Amino acid sequence: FSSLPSYAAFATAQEAYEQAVANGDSEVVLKKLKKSLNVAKSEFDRDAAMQRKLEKMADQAMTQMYKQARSEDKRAKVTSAMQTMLFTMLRKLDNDALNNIINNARDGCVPLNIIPLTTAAKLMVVIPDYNTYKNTCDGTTFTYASALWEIQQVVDADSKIVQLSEISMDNSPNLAWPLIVTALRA
Amino acid sequence: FSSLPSYAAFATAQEAYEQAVANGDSEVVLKKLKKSLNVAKSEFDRDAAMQRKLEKMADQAMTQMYKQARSEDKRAKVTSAMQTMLFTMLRKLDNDALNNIINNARDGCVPLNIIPLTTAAKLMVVIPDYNTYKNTCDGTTFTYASALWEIQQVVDADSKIVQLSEISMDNSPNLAWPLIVTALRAN
Amino acid sequence: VGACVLCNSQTSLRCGACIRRPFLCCKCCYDHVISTSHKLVLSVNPYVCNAPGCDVTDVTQLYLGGMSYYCKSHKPPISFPLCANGQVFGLYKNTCVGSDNVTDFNAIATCDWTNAGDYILANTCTERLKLFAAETLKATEETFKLSYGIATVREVLSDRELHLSWEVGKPRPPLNRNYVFTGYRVTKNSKVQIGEYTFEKGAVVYRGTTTYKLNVGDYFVLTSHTVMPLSAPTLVPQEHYVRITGLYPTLNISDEFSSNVANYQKVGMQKYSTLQGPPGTGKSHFAIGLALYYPS
Amino acid sequence: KMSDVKCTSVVLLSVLQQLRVESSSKLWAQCVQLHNDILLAKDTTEAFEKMVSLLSVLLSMQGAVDINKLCE
Amino acid sequence: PYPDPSRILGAGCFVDDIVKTDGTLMIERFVSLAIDAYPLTKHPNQEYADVFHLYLQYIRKLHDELTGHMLDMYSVMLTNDNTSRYWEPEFYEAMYTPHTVL
RNA sequence: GCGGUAGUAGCAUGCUAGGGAGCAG
RNA sequence: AGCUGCUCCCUAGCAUGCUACUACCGC
Ligand SMILES: [Zn+2]
Ligand SMILES: [Zn+2]
Ligand SMILES: [Zn+2]
Incomplete structure (x- = not known):
């Protein structure tokens, strides 16, 4: 810190003492500049001490309040960041059993229960259109979760059982399309 | 520290110093106005620095007693709340059956684990599964603690009302199953 | 944490004594605090x-001491003036540009929206400043409408008229449908659901939204919603495209929109066009002929 | 590879829990059970099948708009 | 006494709240954990000392990215910190030598 | 030329108080 | 939403201590 007013007075006193010691004339005339220069570092290191601590005071307070602002802005967005992070990890995971059901849900095949894992036990998969039917169900076998299921109880949305052979392209616009195709694992 | 008897005196001493320095008459004048700034400095040493500490002391005392006042207000509030809780919860217990059960004690001191047993006006059962339900609360009425209770308002974990016909054997796996049956004391 | 009103510089300071508590940058916030009576700032x-x-x-009057902001006599020996350099202490300190002309936004902040010149200011100042003029205008008068008395019914004379008392201290609002009241049914627990009525003098004739029977002691209030600051300016900048982009013209047209078709030829080629809408010339005919010209 | 499964199971149960799935006791019990099996698993295949079984729970719901959050 | 390395890594990864998914806000917990996970540095098993070294490098990255973030939000940096001792082993070595400096 | 006291600044140690976080039972 | 114990970091205060600069006093 050199841009303070007392630095100029200290510099003048230092120049005076440099001239005195370069001339080396008196004993008391230079001693004046130990009663006027040794003071010159009393209103200098008193004014240049408090300001230097004030600088770090301001810095510490600013850092504290910046951290508080970040803490208030983070805990108010968790239920978007959690989902983003989850899906990034999932696409990093790279497992076909997952990608199959993720794509299927991205176009509509949302299961209506927990996908069972036993060789027995029931599954129900909504199918809202026909092009979706083309990829998943072929004949009697249901392909989902990279597994082989058996088709048993196709039904329309008005709770009327619809037979399997009926399902075709021309007669497709004759059914309540949100089918619920119950099946069992291999 | 500007309105003290010493600011005037130091100002007068320094005014004499500057006036006679501009005059600059004698070395003794400089000595006198230096020995005047070197005594009237003591005046601004204690008159404006020990009183600078009394302010700190007084502020400390004032905040301390402010804090103690708040301390003694919170006590009144907690006392009022506790006494109100006592006097409002007492109102539910004093049935006549409590008098009948205490007046018959040899002394008047009855155990605590028999007061709700023979005086409570409502029973709460918690059943983990249907098997235990069948041996405890089957039907609309059941007997516990040598009394007769009648069932109403059966609920489940999600605290949704469940009617009595639903709890069969095959329908059981379709219910949240810490079922909490509450019953009234029939007479 | 965002951008101030005039400068749009990233900041973290919000004027406490101000109407809608907007963001202000350090120098910008100081310019407001000295050019208004709004002497409260809230970071x-x-x-x-x-x-x-x-x-x-x-x-x-505040000075920083340690981990807080202190007054004159409460400070420790170590202190620092919060108000220095014409910029109050705040986050995003250097990244503040200040506003040369602040007195406009000082006037809006000190405005009571009483005279026409208030509205002239509300529409003459700059883009987000005039959006804020609308914000403050509305905010003020919803703080106003509930400062009137409550329409407590006293008697039930007959259908379509009642007797009205009003709370002591605050006046009676005008007797028109301009001030739409809303009622709730006072019960042993709380007040719930009457509906929106407007009252005129009989006796107090009540114009109710729905059919309903009232009793003694039920009162209605002039409710307000929660007014939350907008995002976009009043309307997007104008841009005249070369052709009708993104739209597919029709094949043939009916007669009743011919004078309209040679109109939609140009609203389709740029984004917006103010329509001199003289009363009852086929205005909603104009609106439907847009879809007749572009069905999809 | 398995560590990815454990971490993503933790994240999945976090998002499910904040999705107000704990208001259906049987559903929450199943989810918690599956989580604890995944965390205590020692081989990668049963971890993956329990993983897809757990993911099906979130997929069945209609709160997480999927076509957006998979913007790639 | 050295701890179980899985315990240290699990404390590093799994936290509560949301404050601690961001190292900058905390830092100090990494200092304490590196203090606790020091004696693994003298373990003959290779994959134990790397935990301590990872913690040191992570503290360094945390500090010199916090300084950059504060520099880009404001326009000056932490005029003096004397924080280098935190990402050097001399600080942590002091706590297992018999001369108390509380 | 010494001593002492009064001041001011800087530094260290330690004790108390307040806040944050981590480990072990 | 418990009882301890150890350790780090920040700030405040008092006291102590140390050092430096200035003033007064005699010797
Ligand atoms: Zn304002
Ligand atoms: Zn601004
Ligand atoms: Zn104050």
Whole structure:
């Protein structure tokens, strides 16, 4: 810190003492500049001490309040960041059993229960259109979760059982399309 | 520290110093106005620095007693709340059956684990599964603690009302199953 | 945490004594605090004297001491003026540009929206400043409408008329449908659901939204919603494209929109066009002929 | 590879829990059970099948708009 | 006494709240954990000392990215910190030598 | 030329108080 | 939403201590 007013007075006193010691004339005339220069570092290191601590005071307070602002802005967005992070990890995971059901849900095949894992036990998969039917169900076998299921109880949305052979392209616009195709694992 | 008897005196001493320095008459004048700034400095040493500490002391005392006042207000509030809780919860217990059960004690001191047993006006059962339900609360009425209770308002974990016909054997796996049956004391 | 009103510089300071508590940058916030009576500023923490039992609310009297903001006599020896360099202490300190002309936004902040010149200011100042003029205008008068009395019914004379008492201290609002009341049914627990009525003098004739029977002692209030600051300016900048982009013209047209078709030829080629809408010339005919010209 | 499964199971149960799935006791019990099996698993295949079984729970719901959050 | 390395890594990864998914806000917990996970540095098993070294490098990255973030939000940096001792082993070595400096 | 006292600044140690976080039972 | 114990970091205060600069006093 050199841009303070007392630095100029200290510099003048230092120049005076440099001239005195370069001339080396008196004993008391230079001693004046130990009663006027040794003071010159009393209103200098008193004014240049408090300001230097004030600088770090301001810095510490600013850092504290910046951290508080970040803490208030983070805990108010968790239920978007959690989902983003989850899906990034999932696409990093790279497992076909997952990608199959993720794509299927991205176009509509949302299961209506927990996908069972036993060789027995029931599954129900909504199918809202026909092009979706083309990829998943072929004949009697249901392909989902990279597994082989058996088709048993196709039904329309008005709770009327619809037979399997009926399902075709021309007669497709004759059914309540949100089918619920119950099946069992291999 | 500007309105003290010493600011005037130091100002007068320094005014004499500057006036006679501009005059600059004698070395003794400089000595006198230096020995005047070197005594009237003591005046601004204690008159404006020990009183600078009394302010700190007084502020400390004032905040301390402010804090103690708040301390003694919170006590009144907690006392009022506790006494109100006592006097409002007492109102539910004093049935006549409590008098009948205490007046018959040899002394008047009855155990605590028999007061709700023979005086409570409502029973709460918690059943983990249907098997235990069948041996405890089957039907609309059941007997516990040598009394007769009648069932109403059966609920489940999600605290949704469940009617009595639903709890069969095959329908059981379709219910949240810490079922909490509450019953009234029939007479 | 965002951008101030005039400068749009990233900032963290919000004027406490101001109507809608907007963001202000350090120099910009100081310019507001000295050019208004709005002497309260509210950053991520409140700028008040945190020593026990103080009442100072102006920022200039405040000084920083340790981990707080202190008044004149409550400070420790180590202190620092919050109001320095014409910019009040705040986050995003250097990244503040200040506004040359602030007195406009000082006037809006000190405005009571009483005279026509208030509205002239509301529409003459700049883009987000005039959006804020609308914000403050509305905010003021919803703080106004509930400062009137409550329409407590006293008697039920007959159908379509009632008797009305009003609370002591605050006046009676005008007797038109301009001030739409809303009622709730006072019960042993709370007040619930009457509906929106407007009252005129009979006796107090009540124009109710729905059919309903009232009793003695039920009262209605002029409710307000929660008014939350907009995002976009009043309308997007104008841009005249070469052709009707993104739209597919029709094949043939009916007669009743011919004078309209040679109109939609141009609203389709740029984005917006103000329509001199003289009353009852086929205005909703104009609206439907847009779809007749472009069905999809 | 398995560590990815454990971490993503933790994240999945976090998002499910904040999705107000704990208001259906049987559903929450199943989810918690599956989580604890995944965390205590020692081989990668049963971890993956329990993983897809757990993911099906979130997929069945209609709160997480999927076509957006998979913007790639 | 050295701890179980899985315990240290699990404390590093799994936390509560949301404050601690961001190292900058905390830092100090990494200092304490590196203090606790020091004696693994003298373990003959290779994959134990790397935990301590990872913690040191992570503290360094945390500090010199916090300084950059504060520099880009404001326009000056932490005029003096004397924080280098935190990402050097001399600080942590002091706590297992018999001369108390509380 | 010494001593002492009064001041001011800087530094260290330690004790108390307040806040944050981590480990072990 | 428990009882301890150890350790780090920040700030405040008092006291102590140390050192430096200035003033007064005699010797
Ligand atoms: Zn304002
Ligand atoms: Zn601004
Ligand atoms: Zn104060």
